[PDB]
Symmetry: D2
Subunit: 458 residues, 4 copies
């Protein structure tokens, strides 16, 4: 009962799992610590995390505690066929597949909900994009009563869930595991300072030392990425709208500049400050806004400059005017060449042009695999610990006199994160000093924890 295209590729995926499993000591520590206790015995879960080589390890930890899972996908493209087949090669049925059919990933989801005609006894839901949440709440209202908790990991998907609580029909407590410190720090400031320079140097094979680059935004992603260039000898300037992030940039050794004169964006050609644009060799966008690099900027920029993007959306740079006015030429599968001569008819070589690296999209995926396995360790143990927490309280088994008391969406409490951090530190080989009772009394916390309040920003 599998839809995976090719099942014979399991051994390749098996050894890829084996090499990938070693670099994720968190899940190994969770498997060792809770072995023999079996805290997930009798649990039935259905979920749709994006299928990759690490996702196959994530399922392996869950089944090690005695759970039964049926699997699907949250998108169309993020699914490695050989790894999914390797999971299918075991006793776990899987349905994720790279069929490239947008009208067919919905029908794949329908098979996990119902085994054969009759619906399945679902206790926990491990959602990624929130579409499973909506399909359960809309098409099968009767199954929701036997659900203990759901788990969501995405951006602005929790935003939809929070508002749906106010509008009613949400009868199950939910966890906002996205706000974990470990996962937040691993996702933004660490996975970037390792992959930005690698993707750039793979795409262009240029030399960075001595050149000048401009960075838009100094948020989490912008700070994590701004230090991948200054450590290479580049001279870096920062652009921002939030004064506090600008102050942090000033105190960190950078310089803050504005593309428009006086920072005012009037829209006329007189607003563009061409003086500073005649010395720039590279522009990066780290913000999540829209049209932060407009059409007027790209005319006044210095020749042969490079262009790239890190934000999730693609409308940071005015690609519509660029496609409407200037012609494109391809250098290699993911590098493009755009001239400013005219609509068509460029020479073999020219002196007036620019360069794009990901046709205005996410550079981390176009040029490279993405984050490594070590960094993505934290984001996958939070899910498991949260399932542990929600499986024991048994919301669905409680009578109606306390449904209103326990019906809310919350975040993961501080204690469970520290366990993951301790396991990760033990992965590196570090050692932690246990507190004597006198010192714990002096600082007024328990020996086991927690060590910090909820108003603390690490």
């Amino acid at each position: 009962d599998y839809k995976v295209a090719d099942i014979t590729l399991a051994a390749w995926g098996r050894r890829e799992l084996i090499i990938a499993e070693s670099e994720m000591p968190a899940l190994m520590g969770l498997r060792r610590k809770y072995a023999g206790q079996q805290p997930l015995k009798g649990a039935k879960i259905l979920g749709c995390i994006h299928m990759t080589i690490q996702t196959g390890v994530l399922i392996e930890t869950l089944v090690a505690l005695g759970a039964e899972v049926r699997w699907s996908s949250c998108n169309i493209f993020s699914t490695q066929d050989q790894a999914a087949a390797a999971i299918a090669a075991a006793g776990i049925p899987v349905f994720a597949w790279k069929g490239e059919t947008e009208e067919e990933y919905e029908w794949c989801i329908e098979q996990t909900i119902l085994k054969d005609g009759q619906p399945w006894d679902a206790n926990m839901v491990l959602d990624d994009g929130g579409d499973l949440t909506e399909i359960l709440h809309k098409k099968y209202p009767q199954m929701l009563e036997r659900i203990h908790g759901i788990t969501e990991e995405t951006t602005t998907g929790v935003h939809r869930l929070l508002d749906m609580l106010k509008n009613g029909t949400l009868k199950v407590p939910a966890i906002n595991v996205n706000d974990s410190v470990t996962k937040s720090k691993n996702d933004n400031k660490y996975g970037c300072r390792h992959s930005l320079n690698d993707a750039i140097k793979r795409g262009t094979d240029h030399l960075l030392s001595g050149k000048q680059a401009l960075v838009i935004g100094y948020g989490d992603v912008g700070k994590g990425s701004s230090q991948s260039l200054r450590q290479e000898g580049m001279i870096v300037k920062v652009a921002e709208v939030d004064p506090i992030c600008a102050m942090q940039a000033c105190m960190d050794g950078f310089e803050v500049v504005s593309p428009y004169k006086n920072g005012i964006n009037d829209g006329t050609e007189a607003s563009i400050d061409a003086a500073l644009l005649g010395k720039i060799d590279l522009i990066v966008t780290t913000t999540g806004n829209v049209n932060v690099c407009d059409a007027n900027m790209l005319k006044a920029l210095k020749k042969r400059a490079v262009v790239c993007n890190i934000g999730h959306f693609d409308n940071e740079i005015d690609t519509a005017f660029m496609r409407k006015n200037w012609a494109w030429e391809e250098v290699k599968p993911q590098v493009h060449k755009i001239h400013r001569t005219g609509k068509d008819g460029f020479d073999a070589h020219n002196d007036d042009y620019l360069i794009l690296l990901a046709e205005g999209r996410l550079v981390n995926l176009g040029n490279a695999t993405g984050h490594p396995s070590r960094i993505m360790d934290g984001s996958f143990a939070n899910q498991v610990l949260a399932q542990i927490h929600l499986f024991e309280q048994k919301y669905a088994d409680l009578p109606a006199a306390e449904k209103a008391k326990r019906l809310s969406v919350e975040v993961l409490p501080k204690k469970l994160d520290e366990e993951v951090a301790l396991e990760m530190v033990k992965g590196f080989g570090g050692v932690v000093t246990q507190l004597t009772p006198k010192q714990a009394e002096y600082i007024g916390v328990s020996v086991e924890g927690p060590f910090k309040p909820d108003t603390y920003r690490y």
Copy 2:
């Protein structure tokens, strides 16, 4: 004028330092200019207890220029600078502080701060850093407490005392957590220690740091600042922590996590200490703020001629009381001591079995140096001033009994004021911020002018 300073001749030098320092702190000068006509502190009375360096003088002077009259003393024994005290006292302003005092003189400073001519001062707010002055007010003189509108706290260890008194209801007047603003926690705790730590070490020991090995205890904000101050000079740094989150961050920043005790278990016996690791470290810095984090049995197993100093706010992190009973002390120079091991009655003048200790385990950046640059103190003194502005308008003591029941709590400053302070800080460096267009602001769900981040944002 209450003349009590070590020397008075040093006023002019402090005056020139004050003139130069004003050009350094632009946000505070701009606040003074903008709030010059409103006089939002008309009739405000303050008590002051903070480090008496040259930066605090401009804050005191703007407080005076905004219609407030105040009294001051030093938070710590080794904090005052004589030129600043002389220059400020030359302006007809009472103050009581100098450098190198004793514990009895230290407490006499507070008892002079809160008393005048045998009668209690008619103070309406209190400014405290350290929490000792609050304890003196609360314990011995409860009769003046109800006349208080609020108190400002400058450091974390004071906030701990405020919270523990709030838990048992001993706190009777509300307080503002000044130490919580983003322009405070991510500026003073981190960047200033980074600028100041190596300066004090060099001014005290003159030792070369490149190629040596050091151990830093704790990885909070002060720990991060210290690690940055040390590694940038070319050292080999190791960090010890009790919070797993901070250990993970230390592993992420490129440092190593080690524990002096075997298996991280403090057994207390002389055997549990991992003497192999301590037989290589040349410098120890304590950042935790806990008590007795530097055990007596670890000090006996260190390398000869090792350096010991403290950056925390208390002197209980190092077992300096154990040394004073068993080992002999000789003074190299002011604030520098050689402690010879294995003996008390005397020391061989050429003996090599000794240690060097700086500032007797107290604050190291203040006792041995000047502390922080004014460019850093500006971002804190602005929040202090604004918090006092907000606090004075409440007039807590004049509310009816019912209102006081729902007004006794702790809280923070709004984000808009902090963003204004940051904006005025940035422009001093010569930078330019870009303003949004209405379409972008409506896209990100934010106004053109106002807060840009939600409350749960960790920055």
Copy 3:
């Protein structure tokens, strides 16, 4: 005739040659300067450096002045198929492809000398490593009558030239281009620094922030490698045999240790500091010596360790040990898994293996592309200058009386290198101040002549 992997990549190649032409201002300036006179009319060159994009640009510059060239691969895993095909499309026979074999590596050199069944009338020589020079000097010395000079790129070559000069078996003058400042303090120091971590990531996909490494040797290449591994958050230590280099490393912020107790190496298993090797994760050797990593340290290394090497010859690591007692498994090109159990057989579930990069040869070229264009520009400008200088003398057409006075190893003067440095500076947009007559008189040099004396170490 020729043999390359494929030729259809000539369009993409030519696009990359055009884009790389813009990042080498010095070579463009010299090609513009000498195109109108062609000093190399009739000059014939037989070169054997690495065949890459820069090398193709160098060949184009050589043929732009009227020369005739032939080429072959310098290392077994260094050539680029696209660049070789693009140059072969220009009318120059070339023999180089990836995945070559040691016996087949000799095949390339044998036919670059022979033309249509006869040896060719080569006049000048370019080599990188001295492997072709020994073949020339060892089998048939009848070529050296008409050869005007020999040029060497690397330090090992110069060592071999001097070792031959000790015996007096050398018969042709050589001009040293290695010891030029614009080459020694640029190529070794900055190319390896800019490329080593990228080559590591292109093949490991690990997280380098929070690991342990050891780098052996602290030369210019060693300094570059140590600075390269610093910026990735790694923890590194330096082992040296030279007191001065050890002092410099100690002053740079490293820990200096040796894998031997008190430094004494005798061969017994009891002479190895087993504790230190039990926690190291990555090892890189940058020495140029023999038996730098003996057999006994490979037995006492920590599980799951990565082995790296950027030496020209494969004598740093005792590979015969593995080939005679251990078994290898390949996960992907230029990466193998070497188990420490036996050569008979193994299982995938074991954890007693080692990870090796590029089978122990140069990983800068084996696992990556190599140096960028802007770094090779400075080397190729000096190469072209020395190439033009030596031909004008016409050594091979002189009587023995003047032949006696010319057998010598010479270098380029100081003044010529300063022009190349000036051209490289203006590529970044910088401006160099001009000395006034008074200042020039006071210092003791002419207003525009060489400024530093011959003994300056820089």
Copy 4:
């Protein structure tokens, strides 16, 4: 005899002596020579003249010289570079010295003359140890009669080396001299890392200014220039480099710096129109590391941004135009070694001026003026090399040789590399590092004896 000294005072000896006894553990190489050569005393009968800044480390060097059987007299190389405590400590030990702080050039010349003149009569010296060639040039100028008995001279700085080279080129030098600046453990150790260690400390303790987010301009990219540029960056500073040498500019560009010129296109003519006034209007800190003349002209201090900091790290003061300052603008002091320069005029002074200028150490050495110089572990190698050079040259006996052989012994030479390796090896062991030793196979393959030296004479490191 010993009584005739002149220092700040006496009482600082007890504390100074503690500083020396602390420093003895910080300099292993010098103590290694002290232990090795004290049993045979190869310096007996030497009468050494000396001129280098008086500090703690130089006091330990003087103690090392006496421990081998020397009779030395010492003085000041720089006007502001003395230390009171070490000067008091050495004086009470029986070795006469003449050095204090905040003197005038008359007193400086008086001390220089008095060091070489004993009881009104020229002193029958056999050795000279100068720094900068001042004392060496005096003898060729006023006392030509001392040079028939003087065995040799030693030189420490680059400017002194250049002066001796010019003297030899003109054919007026009389006595052979050895330059110790060219040794690897001197050129690539003292000039670079010590300037790195001591640059920002002087700024930090002279002005107490934050260095994050500021802009500075470093002129010159020698060894000292490289060290200073590396010292400024590590504090979080955006700094710029200018030069006249293309190769060093290429190195600076590769390092991660921007190369600009303080003139419109690099051509200077003395006209104000040639100044790149836009760039100089936003620069806060200036450092000159050239040793040339007039690298900071009047039109740079007439066009700089207000409230900027000015410094010099080269040997001599003429590198910047102080003479313009002394007669066009007014001066006022805030603290010792710090000043205020006002561009409004030489009168009309008022404390609330907003376009003032700040100058550090009056254009002399700032690492030794506003700070206490390099640490002991760096000066260890330089002093060990100096004492080794003195020991080696004392064994040749140039004065007593016949004039026929004297013609072939007049040159400027450098020490053999084996002594450099000995110094470096004993320096390393003060850190804890362990140096590997070669097996016969590796020694034969490399082609170098197991005992050193392992590198040719053309290596640059």
